[PDB]
Amino acid sequence: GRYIGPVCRLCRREGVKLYLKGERCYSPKCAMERRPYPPGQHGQKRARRPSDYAVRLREKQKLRRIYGISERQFRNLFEEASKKKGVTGSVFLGLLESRLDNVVYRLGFAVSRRQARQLVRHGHITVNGRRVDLPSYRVRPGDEIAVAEKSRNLELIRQNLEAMKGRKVGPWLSLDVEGMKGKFLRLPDREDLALPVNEQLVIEFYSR
Template identity: 30%
Template sequence: MSWNKFNLYNLAHRALPPQTSRKTLFQQRWEAKRLTRGYHGDHLTERQWQRLFNAGGRATSSTLPSLTFAALERRLEVAVFRCLFAPSVMAAHQMIRHGAVQVNEKKMLYPSYRLKDGDMITVDPDAIPMLKRGESPKEPHTYTPRDYSQPFHFLPDYLEVDYATCSAVFLREPVARPGRSEIPSPYPPHTHQLAYEFYVRKRG
């Protein structure tokens, strides 16, 4: 999860499902695990990543693989990145560690903090690299993303962001249903399914 131009280039060229016609089912699952871990869980240890799949879920079998990744969206570092306040999850991690992020008006120093529905996130404007100060104190800040990253920017429906106050509200956990998922990912649900099967089979 990064707006780095090299990362965006790689994601753009990996957006299509990998060719699987000549791969065994195990190889397809392993490749899906590698891809999803590289995007959704690069900031996690392998043990933390495996816990996602051990936790199970309340969804039907067709939506459970995608919902497995929904828990990650509650992590404060991921939410700060999704709000476009940081150019990467690792940058958001550092912002939180340096005391630039508050949750419900209280400084939060734990990047892995799990947000609850309705939690308000506030970020110090000086810590946001894409924010340019006005020439005078009375002029508002201007949010200016890098040109090459703008086509990739979006705000998920489960976040409400106000750039004038550098704050956001985590409305709810993303949902998934057959044919549609709110979990932001460069990979299709089929890839999530294969990654889920890799860990479920391994666990069994």
């Protein structure tokens, strides 16, 4: 089961703020806000020049932790990326960005990814009409991701979909806040995203 445990601690081990909570991570409290040092009894102690390896490990752990995906699944995507034509780095990101659970989150249907995930597992999500509770489901270009008719009235749904009014969204995505529909226009360009991650090191980590 995708991690599930103290999360605003991973932010602390990566020395960078990851959004694994949506809000709370915006209001002075993602911990990174005054307490940016690693978790644990030695968190405040001076760090030692990390090994080329350490650097590469933490980088992958960053990107991977951002999407709350497992090593098993993360690796399988990367291997797929390698094989495919074109720059593995971007292509990899493109694939991570195509996970239904992620897209749900991108469209704002949920505040964080872990929430977006649950929304999927519980059928509150629809792809071209049909229900789909597979958070790893790969959204293709042209697919319409909406909210289940029966779920459109849920308290949590309104709140999030409300806050989405006026809010802009991914240049590769499009949100019709009305009927609570969204459309995966195209695979995001590396230029499209802006994750605190140097995918180049990630490729290197697996090249070892």
